A paper describes a structure:
Using a matrix microseeding (MMS) approach (D'Arcy et al., 2014), we successfully crystallized the OL3:My4LMy5 complex and solved its structure at the 3.1 Å resolution. While the myomesin My4 domain and its C-terminal linker L as well as obscurin-like-1 OL3 are well defined in the structure, the entire myomesin My5 domain is invisible in electron density maps. The OL3:My4L complex is present as a (OL3:My4L)2 dimer of heterodimers in the crystal. Individual OL3:My4L complexes display a bent dumbbell-shaped structure, in which the myomesin L linker extends away from the My4 domain integrating within the OL3 fold. LH leads the C-terminal portion of L, an 18-amino-acid-long extended stretch divided into two β-strands (LS′ and LS″) that integrate within the OL3 Ig fold. In OL3, the A β-strand that is hydrogen-bonded to B is missing and is replaced by myomesin LS′ (Ser618-Thr622), thus re-establishing a complete Ig architecture. A second myomesin strand (LS″, Ile626-Glu630) also hydrogen bonds to B″ at a position that is reminiscent of the A′ positioning found in a few deviant I-set Ig domains, identified as the I∗-set subtype (Pernigo et al., 2015). Thus, OL3A is a complex trans-complemented hybrid I/I∗-set Ig fold. Overall, the OL3:My4L interface area is 1,046 Å2. In the case of OL3:My4L, this binding mode provides a surprisingly high mechanical stability to the complex (∼135 pN), a rupture force significantly higher than that required to unfold OL3 alone (∼85 pN) and quantitatively similar to that exhibited by the myomesin C-terminal dimer (∼137 pN) (Berkemeier et al., 2011) required for myosin crosslinking.
Numbering used by the authors:
A (entry chain N), B (entry chain M): 510 to 632
C (entry chain P): 242 to 339
D (entry chain O): 243 to 339
Write the structure that this text describes.
Amino acid sequence: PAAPLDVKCLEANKDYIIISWKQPAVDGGSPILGYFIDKCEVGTDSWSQCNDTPVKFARFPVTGLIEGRSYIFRVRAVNKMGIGFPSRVSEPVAALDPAEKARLKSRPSAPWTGQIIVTEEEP
Amino acid sequence: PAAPLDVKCLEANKDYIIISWKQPAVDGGSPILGYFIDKCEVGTDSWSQCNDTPVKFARFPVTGLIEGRSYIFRVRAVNKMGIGFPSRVSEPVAALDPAEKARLKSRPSAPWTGQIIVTEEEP
Amino acid sequence: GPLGSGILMAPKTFWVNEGKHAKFRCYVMGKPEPEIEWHWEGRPLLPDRRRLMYRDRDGGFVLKVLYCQAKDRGLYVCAARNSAGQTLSAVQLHVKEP
Amino acid sequence: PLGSGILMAPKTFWVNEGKHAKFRCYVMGKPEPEIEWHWEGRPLLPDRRRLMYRDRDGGFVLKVLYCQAKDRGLYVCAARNSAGQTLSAVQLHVKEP
């Protein structure tokens, strides 16, 4: 089956993140029995399958989030024959309550300045 | 009188900083009665005269330092026929006890990552 | 506040024309010298003929993907880590097909 | 955010007299920190000879054109925002022909 489209995050919390997606183009090969959702902690390259059996409902709550860490998501469609390739991955989603994300986003940090690199140029 | 040379810091503390300098090229205009030392907190452009009357001894302890702030220094020679221009300013000197300067210098800092700047090129 | 760009905020999207090169520049600060690596769509990016990585003289690390194809679209992440911590920056590449 | 050449001794970069000298410095901060240059404890102001602009690669640039022996000294890049201020320093020496 064709890969699902437009993976986005509807809602996000320390506890769980609810992610949705657009259904792929109807190939008529075998009806889509459901979908598998995979999560990855942004830094690592470890992709883990969130649901053990397929889900039909095109919005899904993801659990098992380490608080304060940011995650990306992909979806794979599944039919009778097997599983398709993954969707284009989502924008990163941080596992924070909305107020803490707002707080961090609008927080000042003292400036840092790099070494001054001096070079000669020719008039 | 000619401006003094090589303004260097001999010793540095939270309490005071001892700064030395090389005497300028000797002239038959008038004997050097002493010197004036000026300090400036690195960020600001405010230069303050440390000693009210000239000092002959070519090393001088500077007080009135706000702890943890970094300072630069210049010296002006003075004779019977007035005060000369200032010396080339010193390397910055932080008002910290030696152990605290060592501690800060060898302290690990978590990495910070800048925005990714994407640009188009062609061969 | 080492939060890193495009991780908490939504990453920027930069469009590139198909067949042309795309340069990704990212400046990073840290003691000790933080080791950096690139990722694409949650996969590690590895030096190829097509994909090249070097540190630009005058500071920051560069990733260069040559002769962009539609398939090259995705989330590009610059991960940087040292003894004290790790921080990521992210960005999205879209490809303009002729 | 300690800043280069303030706690450590600043680097000394030699330039040939009559040539241009480019000073590049990258700075991070929220909010966007306002930056200013200083020379020998004096504020540096945009002249025909002295130019200041922010590079397309990011980072702020100071360019002193047609270096003279008198241009020697401690060049400091000061950057400040609501939360704080941090400086970087460097020393320029001029090679006379």
